[PDB]
């Protein structure tokens, strides 16, 4: 994989949006306000081994706690997927 820095617009609030809104239906932390996606945002690409999908690493502001969010996207179908969603953590 290649990770790069992406910028925290609306598709990258979109995408922390999402993580809150799987995480509240997976239900660990209870109910979760999304605030906000700060930065940074990272975006893993990965390759067949040609993109497979990509992994995006978001840290996102809920409830007023941060949390360190993983998303995968697979290219070809366009679904995405949250893999992981720890904290609260400390700011980056």
Same mark, same amino acid.
């Given at each position: 994989?290649?990770?790069?820095?992406?910028?925290?617009?609306?598709?990258?609030?979109?995408?922390?949006?999402?993580?809150? @809104?799987?995480?509240?239906?997976?239900?660990?932390? /209870?109910?979760?306000?999304? +605030?906000?996606?700060?930065?940074?945002?990272?975006?893993?690409?990965?390759?067949? +081994?040609?993109?497979?999908?990509?992994?995006?690493?978001?840290?996102?502001?809920?409830? @007023?706690?941060?949390?360190?969010?993983?998303?995968?996207? @697979?290219?070809?179908?366009?679904?995405?997927?949250?893999?992981?969603? +720890? /904290?609260?953590?400390?700011?980056?």
């Amino acid at each position: 994989g290649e990770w790069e820095i992406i910028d925290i617009g609306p598709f990258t609030q979109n995408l922390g949006k999402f993580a809150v @809104d799987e995480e509240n239906k997976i239900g660990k932390y /209870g109910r979760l306000t999304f +605030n906000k996606v700060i930065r940074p945002s990272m975006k893993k690409t990965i390759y067949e +081994n040609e993109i497979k999908g990509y992994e995006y690493q978001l840290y996102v502001r809920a409830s @007023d706690k941060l949390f360190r969010a993983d998303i995968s996207e @697979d290219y070809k179908t366009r679904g995405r997927k949250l893999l992981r969603f +720890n /904290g609260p953590v400390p700011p980056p």
